[PDB]
Each structure stands twice: as C-alpha cells, then as structure tokens.
Ligand binder design. Structure first.
Ligand SMILES: CCCCCCCC/C=C\CCCCCCCC(=O)O
Ligand SMILES: CCCCCCCC/C=C\CCCCCCCC(=O)O
Length: 127
C-alpha cells in the first residue's frame, strides 16, 4: 500500500542535547530548526532511496531492504547499517549501537532516533 512518497518535516523534539551527544554545532541547528527540511522517498524494486534537503543542499542515499549496506556519514566516515521493514507502519533499522524505528503510513512518516536517553522524532506530512 505504502510505497514511495513526498513528505515535509514540520516539527522536531530535542535539539541541543541531541547535537551535543553527536557532534553538531548549536549554530547549525538554530538555522535548521527554523527551516522546514524536505524528505523524498523513492521506491524502486525493493531498492528505496532516501533524499533529504537542507537549505540548499541535497542529500541522496541508497539502501536495500533486508540487507546491510554501507552508508557514509556527514563527516565522510563509512559506517555499516542494516535497514529492514517490519510490515505495515513498522520498520526496524539499526546501525552501530543506535536504535532507529520508522513508522510508515499512507499519509504521514515518523522517524525515531534514540541516543544517550535522547529522543529525536521527525514529523512529516504527505505532499
Ligand atoms: C546521511 C547524512 C545525514 C546527516 C545530515 C543531517 C544533519 C543536518 C545537519 C545540518 C543541516 C543544515 C545544513 C544546511 C546548510 C546550511 C546553509 C549554509 O551553508 O549557510
Ligand atoms: C536521515 C538519513 C540518516 C539515517 C541514519 C541511519 C542510517 C540508515 C540509513 C538508511 C536506512 C534507513 C531507511 C529507513 C528510515 C526511513 C525514514 C523515513 O522514511 O523518513
């Protein structure tokens, strides 16, 4: 039912603690929080690509469902991660030591990132 779609972020919880625990400068977050990022999901034969645009930068990625693929970080470091779907509105993806759960709906897309007791949730609407 749910396969590929355009979604736009409208709100996020927690910033300062999330970035601090990672390595993102508060300067960049402030500018990004006031800007509604963009999210585009491309579904092509089990191969789903995730695209995120920030201000004037476009980020494109590729991953295979039920298969561990190597993705680069914002620092250029190569990390291994396995993304798998659980079915309807439920998908389980874990990398290194962080738990990421994304709920897939035919109208809204929510992402859950937990690191160091920090809760990061992205709310996006269908467009
Ligand atoms: C898979 C890689 C995803 C990691 C990136 C997500 C973190 C977002 C970090 C910064 C977003 C803000 C960047 C926007 C460009 C700033 C504009 C400027 O250059 O002045
Ligand atoms: C925002 C990109 C950075 C993600 C960091 C985790 C690394 C895994 C990368 C790709 C596999 C994840 C794909 C499943 C989550 C989709 C979330 C969404 O639909 O908005």
């Amino acid at each position: 039912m749910n396969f590929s779609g355009k979604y736009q972020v409208q709100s996020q919880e927690n910033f300062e603690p999330f970035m601090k625990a990672m390595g993102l400068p508060e300067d960049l977050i402030q500018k990004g929080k006031d800007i509604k990022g963009v999210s585009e999901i491309v579904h092509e034969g089990k191969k789903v690509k995730l695209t995120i645009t920030y201000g004037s930068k476009v980020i494109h990625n590729e991953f295979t469902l039920g298969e561990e693929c190597e993705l680069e970080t914002m620092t250029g470091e190569k990390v291994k991660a396995v993304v798998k779907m659980e079915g309807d509105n439920k998908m389980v993806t874990t990398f290194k030591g962080i738990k990421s759960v994304t709920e897939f709906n035919g109208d809204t897309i929510t992402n859950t990132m937990t690191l160091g007791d920090i809760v990061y949730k992205r709310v996006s609407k269908r467009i």
